[PDB]
């Protein structure tokens, strides 16, 4: 799991660009986020709800690391939150998020989800 760039709306990570949203588990192993979910409910994906967060849960982890938008307007609901209150949950601005993910890559078990616009 490498990060090269880092920029409003593109993100290139393993050497490949998504101009999109994305979530790395903690395999390394990256998919792209369901947005759409959340949207189904809350008419913006800006309030990530539990019946998302829910699809992510598939390998085991201890960190759920959010890149909340390059200006941190995504948040968890309290009711996803609810869903990880057992693990260490991290929610901060995308590009200082991609940082941190890259400084505590190795050790413990991460699930990222990254928002890569507002």
């Known amino acids: 799991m490498k990060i090269e760039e880092v920029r409003f709306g593109l993100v290139k990570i393993d050497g490949k ?3 999109h949203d994305i979530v790395i588990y903690p395999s ?3 998919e792209r986020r369901m947005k759409e ?3 189904k409910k809350h ?3 800006h309030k990530l709800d539990p019946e998302e967060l829910e699809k992510y849960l ?3 982890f201890d960190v759920l690391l959010v890149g909340t938008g390059i200006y941190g307007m995504l948040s968890l609901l309290p009711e996803s939150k ?3 209150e057992d693990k260490e ?3 901060k601005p995308t590009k200082e998020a991609l940082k941190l ?3 505590l890559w190795g050790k413990k078990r991460i699930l990222a989800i990254i928002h890569v616009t507002c």
């Open 17 to 19: 660009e998504f101009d």
């Open 28 to 30: 390394g192993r990256i």
């Open 37 to 39: 979910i959340s949207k």
């Open 43 to 45: 008419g913006t994906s």
């Open 58 to 60: 598939v390998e085991d």
């Open 82 to 84: 609810k869903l990880v």
């Open 89 to 91: 949950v991290i929610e």
């Open 101 to 103: 993910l890259e400084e």
